[PDB]
Design a protein around this ligand. Structure first.
Ligand SMILES: OC[C@H]1O[C@@H](O[C@@H]2[C@@H](CO)O[C@](O)(CO)[C@H]2O)[C@H](O)[C@@H](O)[C@H]1O
Ligand SMILES: OC[C@H]1O[C@@H](O[C@@H]2[C@@H](CO)O[C@](O)(CO)[C@H]2O)[C@H](O)[C@@H](O)[C@H]1O
Ligand SMILES: OC[C@H]1O[C@@H](O[C@@H]2[C@@H](CO)O[C@](O)(CO)[C@H]2O)[C@H](O)[C@@H](O)[C@H]1O
Ligand code: NA
Lengths: 989, 989
């Protein structure tokens, strides 16, 4: 007998390999004077759990709809209480059997009534700029068609279906479809109509598409202009006017403009233009720039550029894939404020409004097609859509719509086929189509390392070492001599590098030095701009970001989606502050004698005339001198030495020895720009006169012995433990050696290579570093000075079930006012476990104080955190912060907040102040212990316990980027060693 | 200056390598007529966290004691609210730096006042039978000495210190000491005075020690008797009387008793004897037996024996290491009731009272010395006390006290040097001392595989395969020809095997067959007798067992201490019921034609005269015939064929075909024994006439089609899912294929060997077997019979992110009364993941019923659970249990309760009854889902949800012993395959 199952037809369509049906030809997104009506607003919405249960109750007619409630459109509907967001990284959340879909498939029925006036007749269309993942569209009950390609635009002719007056638009949206198999980006799965819905009139004698060709001849200064215009796919008579250039020309003819000012990210010159036919006029912004690959270099307007980039997803912590325009504008301004000049639209085209902002503010853009089949990799790429002939039309269509929509924007300097889609016939077809359609932009795609169908060689997270070999052109050959010759002639880009998850990223400086040294290196794009945190509100009302698994997912990838330089609300992480410094476009090297500074202009086109150069000398008491210096403009890629005013050097020469003083030279905007105000800091450099080494106090005070306690000046010691119980009145609950920290996200990633691929966090756990214990060996007093004495406490630190340890000796000294503490660490037995060497996170001390800290001040680096392979943006100076603001609000709490390179510190314990001095140490102050920090999965898990946890580290490990990419570089690793270091302590009430 | 730390002297003593000081010579535990006073009772107790804080406040004088509270003695003090028990398996809970102790070291001060009458003067002693781990003893403020060796006895002379009238006994007990390094058994760390404290008078002209030598000459039947007696270490004139043997002899002379009845575990003949001098008489029980190794066989009284053994720890779920005598007696009786004949005192000497019970009830005992340095293995045995000359005196002393205390007991047939202590000089010294002192008992020690200093070759958890090679004497040679020749001449024992943790142990039968086949194989001792569960009581008042980590331990090993054949309260696990059958001492093979049975006497000394042989024929209606048969006694190791009464065969011949009937033949005690009552079952065998295969119902009923539902007889199907929603009125919430079960403890252990060492539980998790999903492919009806039709539902089962799946087709048939269900499974793509083949736990169905089940009945195997490599004790029959009693109360909930080999089943869902028939299937019924079972860490985590979860399995995996030892044997593994199987269903209201 026949079939008896329900919904076979809906499901047959969802499983289709075809692109959408019924849509108009793909075209550019154009600003037109044609009437248009946004249908955005409050729609009606009904959710069904699958296609077999989705009602076929004539709901498209909008009459007697039961089960519908209001929903804003555009929206990601799980951000509004309908289902829940779900995060997977690589793994598909459904069985991998393309093109088939699971039974649990949220079906969202959307409906809106609207009014169409006579200006939309006789011809109009409906435009949808994004539907995830499969839409079926009805107007007044007549099926317009379907949509495939979730971040791509679709237009439907409504001529003869749209009626004057009231109309009813209905859209059935399936979360999962065959397209889901090619939309496996590392991000939240979020169904919805998440971009604009527009009704546009199409008057007769209008303009459907426009293709701007605006080249630049850097030898003559000429612009090369051709503006194509078409209607129904045929070239049409149109007039092109560019008033600023005194130009009137016909569409379709190439002309040479005698002297144009060229467009670049540094100088994003745009000329306002209009293309007009009888019934319609289109407004354009034209930036003249030519892109070329020459001598294995990526060049714009005749010059090799340096990409200073980020990977930009579209995410909002409360609206999902809907990013309000005001947030877009602000975040692009924030990027420019941190010296970013390039953006990759990972991994799909952005909102169409994005490109004009990129044109205007100035970014080199890698516009990527909506294609990613990452989940097929684990099966050896079996059934990969990228190589399956049945998917060719679907994938070419994705590329076509990507290219057509954005082809007029100067800011787009590369087209990208997709991301992590393997290699295959359909990728080659997408490349062939793009090269024929638009030869003016090189093609990018990292998935095929042979680079057979691209114009640049692209890699993700290649090590600093391999990048140096590539920059010199000495990487190993491809097996195919012809392909090897082609790839060696290509410039090289890191489409993703220095993974910015949690504490980090480390190793940015070593990449950047290579970028500057080797012309073949185009630069790199950080993974990634933002964390995809989703706001969650508790009963108390306290908000925190959630991540994978916080929404009930059966399969998920945890906090791997919170991996950005800013949080979901665009608050910078420390890594962004470091990144801005690393990529700063000018290098300022201040002379040790304070007589001047060397200034290198790292820009590619602009000189230094936009910048005001300012100097300031700061000391303990505050600013001693400051001013501005006149710098004759320095050409791009040129260098000069600038004399500073004689007062600065003279000031340096007059400082008594050991008095600390910091000279800072800054390059700030002389005037407001489109992205920041005058005085915004772009680059800086410093020369420091360091404070003298701290003088051990004279051991003049003796030790008082008592039954259970010992006193030495202001320090009171427990006689049973040997550690101090109070010092200057401030209670000390515990003092001991530390070798471990609460693992970062990087420490949770695998150290690939060698026989040991355990994450460092696991190595540490296996080794017992998280659970150290101390045995007291002895306490003795020894002859000091003029009757005084030192107190030596000998301990051994180890962990249960381990034979290795470190002997630790504390030697205390005091003159009644200052406390001298020498600490001496010595290995006892080999620190090897499970057959591998144990590494340390740190060599330091943990003071646990029985009172709360309100304020932390220090002299060293700041204001933000710094670790051995980070902190580039932390500058030398004097800093003071409330305790709450020493912490870093990572979504998963982890080690953070250390201030490396500190020379002195003051903790304000209410009425008293504790001072620490010493040779350079790292400083951390927290109101909770390391075990609470490690145990915490979200920030509300952190609770202050009334104490102060003070960490003084003589040595620190780097943080690296091991969550994805290289671990800590050799020079920053911390292997077990012997070590001795001195501190002074003082309590000033 | 001098030291300033506190408690250095106490700690210096705890770190001492010496044995105890001040104690009398080690001697036997003897029953004497000398006056004795137990000091057991309510003592006063004070706990301090370490030696540096333990008061030196003159507390030993018992006057003005502050901070003391009542505590029972004997006790493990963490079982009474003072600190907490802590469980570690191998790892030490302190840093490994012998002989040093951690700062956190519970110090327990014990004190008791008592009255000593004139019968304890002039000479008396104080006896301590166990202190964990280091005791210091004062009497009336005078230091008697110290104790080392936590499960060993110490006696102190109190002559001249004990006063007539009131006395004050004070004992300072440290949990940790240098001895802790040699007491690293896999068990709870439990400090305390955990065995008897006795005041014993020592009258003049008494007897301090006695050494019984009672040999047996199996050729002549003669006993060989010599009883040594000494005082102050010198041989003394004593008289030895043995009334039953008409003997009066002098101590110290060897005599030949003409005809003794020899002692064995099977026939534990004991002769009452008394050794007496003028001032003291000692009562003895003498069992005559000679032990010998001959022709690579372990022999007793001239014959090779088979050890049917368990490893017996001393544990009580509420008293710790204190085992009440009534529990000891009951558990030994329970052992005999399950055919056990041998006990290893893992891994220390037991309570001294244990040995006379072993003598009397009849066990071959391996008495092990208190020595285990397991925690040194992870460092390559660096610093192992067993090879460190500084520990020689400590370790010889442990062996000396072990041997001296128990040397008079016939039940001790082997001395063991210790457990998991590596190899070393001190072990060799312990062996040398023992061989010189007592050559009558072979020496055992598994730690040194070369067997250089032992008389038997011992291994733990050697595979069934390696055991078969050893039994044939073809294992590989040692590199030292001399040592190889010695070891090849040795018999072989598995001191630990078939690890009994959780569901299991599997593979017992394959070991046992080898034991019977190969004389060199002595048998084996199961690890272990009991689970060390500790009772925990919640606010509700519900008790459950806790394990490692349930008491706040920083380092622990979880539920690896709950790994026994009985729970902590001695309730049998299914593995014990299986074990009893596996080791049954008689083999009964019932003839297929029911005319008789073959009977092999597997005993070593006894014939079959103790046994009554009974038969019974059972059918659906109940017993059809039964009686007793007279078996002329069968000699040990002999065989005969016993005719059954003609009525039984005649009954068999008269059964209509397909009618099920079970013939059972049982060997029960003819009369009460010391360990069970008459009628206790010892062995059994069965012959079954199986029920006919179930007849598919005639497909005479058609399918009614409806908008959303389908009806076929009494089955109602959801049209959207294809699965039934009710059947006979009972609601069905879900039906689907299962391939996975909630991992057992064995499934959580590593499959050593191959490139894949992930535990099967992890293999499953990585593969998605725990999270299967089903896609509906189609539903169609097809021509049945006389207008009826079948309904076929086609599905595919897979998991998210996986390409492999199984196609499943359900074909339904009904004649209105019975429902026929054919299920057909077919692999689609290779079930490979992470580069390794995925194995299945099962091929079955899960019915989730929307109503509760009160009663489960079946015909198959029972009453207890059975899996492919277990269930030996489950016999064929008809069974019925309430739902609660289908479950197995393992401490960590896990897969359990399957009844393999079922042919029919009836679930009573209140007023209705669901019947299932089919070819052999496994049956499981639960009131909670598999995910709740897996998630649960303790039994209170299980919660009934109102449903019934019914599992019908066409195939099951074995359970093995992978938690420690071999995994599932090849023949019981379940690799992916195609499969088809049929069921019938019927609801009788
Ligand atoms: O956050 C990781 C980002 O990097 C890439 O994904 C990573 C791949 C690259 O082959 O390596 C892993 O670490 C393996 O799991 C991936 O996470 C993606 O291109 C980015 O979209 C993003 O996921
Ligand atoms: O419950 C395990 C029992 O077996 C032995 O310990 C195991 C050793 C044998 O070398 O192998 C391990 O599985 C490794 O961890 C141990 O658990 C002990 O002899 C027994 O006392 C007991 O622990
Ligand atoms: O503690 C005295 C013991 O005497 C033992 O036997 C004598 C010892 C004394 O050196 O040496 C022997 O040869 C035994 O090895 C005997 O002559 C007793 O057997 C012990 O029980 C005990 O009495
Ligand atoms: Na165990």
């Amino acid at each position: 007998g026949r079939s008896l199952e329900l919904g076979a037809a809906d499901i047959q369509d969802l499983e289709s390999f075809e692109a959408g049906r019924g849509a108009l030809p793909a075209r550019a997104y154009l600003q037109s004077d044609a009437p248009r009506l946004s249908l955005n607003g409050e729609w009606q919405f009904r959710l069904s759990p699958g296609s077999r249960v989705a009602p076929d109750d004539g709901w498209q007619l909008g009459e007697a709809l039961n089960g519908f409630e209001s929903l804003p459109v555009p929206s990601s509907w799980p951000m509004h209480g309908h289902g829940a967001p779900a995060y997977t990284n690589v793994q598909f959340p459904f069985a991998v059997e393309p093109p088939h879909v699971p039974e649990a498939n949220p079906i969202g029925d959307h409906l809106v009534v609207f009014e169409a006036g006579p200006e939309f007749f006789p011809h109009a269309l409906l435009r949808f700029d994004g539907i995830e993942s499969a839409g079926t569209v009805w107007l007044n009950g007549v099926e317009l068609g379907t949509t495939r390609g979730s971040r791509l635009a679709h237009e439907f002719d409504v001529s003869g279906i749209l009626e004057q007056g009231e109309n009813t638009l209905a859209v059935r949206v399936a979360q999962f479809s065959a397209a889901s198999y090619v939309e496996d980006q590392d991000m939240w799965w979020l169904p919805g109509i998440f971009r604009d819905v527009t009704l546009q009139a199409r008057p007769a004698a209008g303009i459907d598409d426009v293709f701007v060709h605006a080249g630049y001849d850097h030898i003559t200064g000429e612009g090369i202009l051709k503006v194509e215009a078409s209607r129904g796919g045929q070239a049409i008579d149109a007039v092109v006017r560019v008033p600023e250039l005194a130009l009137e020309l016909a569409a379709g003819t190439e002309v040479r403009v005698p002297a144009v000012e060229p467009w670049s990210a540094e100088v994003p010159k745009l000329y306002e233009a209009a293309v007009s036919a009888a019934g319609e006029s289109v407004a354009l912004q034209i930036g003249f720039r030519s892109i070329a690959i020459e001598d294995a270099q990526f060049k714009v307007n005749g010059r090799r550029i340096l990409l200073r980039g980020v990977n930009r997803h579209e995410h909002h912590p409360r609206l999902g894939r809907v990013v309000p325009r005001d947030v877009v504008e602000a975040e692009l301004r924030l990027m420019k404020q941190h010296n970013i000049n390039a953006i990759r639209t990972s991994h799909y085209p952005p909102h169409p409004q994005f490109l004009a902002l990129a044109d205007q503010l100035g970014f080199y853009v890698v516009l990527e097609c909506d294609l990613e089949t990452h989940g097929f990799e684990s099966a050896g790429w079996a059934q990969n859509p990228s190589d399956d002939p049945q998917w060719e039309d679907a994938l070419v269509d994705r590329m076509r719509r990507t290219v057509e929509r954005d082809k007029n924007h100067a800011s787009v300097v590369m087209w990208s086929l997709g991301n992590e889609a393997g290699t295959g016939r359909n990728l080659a077809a997408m490349s062939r189509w793009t090269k024929d359609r638009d030869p003016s932009r090189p093609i990018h795609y990292e998935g095929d390392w042979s680079s057979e169908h691209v114009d640049v060689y692209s890699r993700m997270y290649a090590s600093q070492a391999e990048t140096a070999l590539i920059g010199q052109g000495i990487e190993p050959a491809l097996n195919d001599a012809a392909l090897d010759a082609r790839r060696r002639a290509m410039p090289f880009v890191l489409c993703q590098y220095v993974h910015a998850m949690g504490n980090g990223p480390g190793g940015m400086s070593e990449y950047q030095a290579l970028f500057e040294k080797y012309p073949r290196l185009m630069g790199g794009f950080v993974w990634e701009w933002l964390e995809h945190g989703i706001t969650v509100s508790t009963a108390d009302g306290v908000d925190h970001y959630g991540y994978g698994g916080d929404f009930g997912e059966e399969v998920h990838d945890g906090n791997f989606v919170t991996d950005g330089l800013v949080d979901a609300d665009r608050r910078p992480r420390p890594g962004l502050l470091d990144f801005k410094k690393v990529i700063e476009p000018l290098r300022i090297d201040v002379a040790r004698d304070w007589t001047g500074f060397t200034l290198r202009n790292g820009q590619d086109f602009a000189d230094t005339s936009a910048f005001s150069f300012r100097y300031e000398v700061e000391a303990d008491g505050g600013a001693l001198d400051g001013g501005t210096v006149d710098v004759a403009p320095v050409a791009p890629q040129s260098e000069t030495v600038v004399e500073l005013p004689g007062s600065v050097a003279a000031l340096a020469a007059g400082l008594s020895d050991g008095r600390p003083a910091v000279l800072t030279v800054r390059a700030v905007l002389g005037a407001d720009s489109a992205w920041a105000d005058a005085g915004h800091e772009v680059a800086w450099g410093q020369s420091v006169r360091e404070p003298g080494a701290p003088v051990p106090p004279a051991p003049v005070e003796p030790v008082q012995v008592q039954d259970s306690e010992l006193t030495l000046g202001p320090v009171v010691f427990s006689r049973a433990t040997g550690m101090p119980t109070s010092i200057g009145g401030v209670p000390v609950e515990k003092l001991g050696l530390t070798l471990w920290w609460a693992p970062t996200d990087n420490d949770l990633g695998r150290e690939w290579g060698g026989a040991d691929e355990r994450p460092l966090a696991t190595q540490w756990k296996d080794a017992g570093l998280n659970r150290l214990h101390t045995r007291l060996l002895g306490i003795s007093a020894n002859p000091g000075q003029d009757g005084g004495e030192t107190l030596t406490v000998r301990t051994r630190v180890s962990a249960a079930d381990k034979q290795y340890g470190v002997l630790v000796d504390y030697t205390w000294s005091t003159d009644g006012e200052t406390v001298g503490l020498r600490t001496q660490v010595r290995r006892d037995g080999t620190w090897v476990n499970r057959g591998f060497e144990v590494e340390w996170a740190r060599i330091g001390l943990e003071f646990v104080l029985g009172e709360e800290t309100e304020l932390v001040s220090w002299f060293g680096q700041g204001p933000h955190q710094s670790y051995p392979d980070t902190g580039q943006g932390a500058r030398a100076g004097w800093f003071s912060l409330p305790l709450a603001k020493m912490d870093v609000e990572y979504v998963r709490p982890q080690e953070c907040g250390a201030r490396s390179g500190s020379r002195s510190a003051a903790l304000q314990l209410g009425g008293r102040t504790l001072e620490i001095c010493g040779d350079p140490f790292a400083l951390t102050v927290r109101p909770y212990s390391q075990d609470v920090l490690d145990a915490a999965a979200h920030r509300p898990d952190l609770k202050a316990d009334g104490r102060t946890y003070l960490y003084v580290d003589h040595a620190l490990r780097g943080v690296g980027t091991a969550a994805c990419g290289p671990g800590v570089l050799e020079q920053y690793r911390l292997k077990p060693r012997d070590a001795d270091f001195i501190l002074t302590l003082k309590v000033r009430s």
